[PDB]
Amino acid sequence: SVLKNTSVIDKIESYVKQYKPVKIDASKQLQVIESFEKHAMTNAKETESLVSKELKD
């Protein structure tokens, strides 16, 4: 209602309407992060076991 001789509000409306799907989100943190984490818990359990037996000794 503020603009009277807009001549552009339809164009920008359509441009935003066609722009909201910018691209597909990556969400693919499962190729090097997963391997790092797997190694993480594996040798972390190893270290927990060794420090535990060292404490008992």
Binding site: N5, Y19, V22, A26, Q31, V32, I33, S35, F36, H39
Partner: protein, 89 residues
């Protein structure tokens, strides 16, 4: 009085053929009929950014990257640096 009709016809004749109705220009030589909607159509366009911000360029930026599927090599590199940092503790 005389002014009560004279000034109303003054502000209803020249503004009629000055804008709104958008045809001809009687009172002064320079016409604003093709000036405000055609020449001034690019006025704010010149004032603002053209072809970048007025059109809202759909700049599809590169998606966020990662470790590029780095193998166990970086894992044992991290192991080595952690070990050499903790050796002097």
């Amino acid at each position: 009085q005389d002014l009560y009709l004279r000034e109303l016809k003054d502000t209803k004749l020249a503004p009629s053929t000055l804008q709104d109705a958008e045809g001809n220009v009687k009172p002064w030589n320079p016409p604003q009929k093709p000036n405000l909607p055609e020449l001034e159509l690019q006025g704010p366009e010149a004032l603002k950014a053209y072809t970048e911000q007025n059109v809202e360029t759909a700049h599809v930026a590169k998606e966020s990257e990662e470790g590029e599927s780095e193998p166990i090599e970086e894992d044992w590199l991290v192991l080595d640096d952690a070990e050499e940092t903790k050796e002097s503790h």
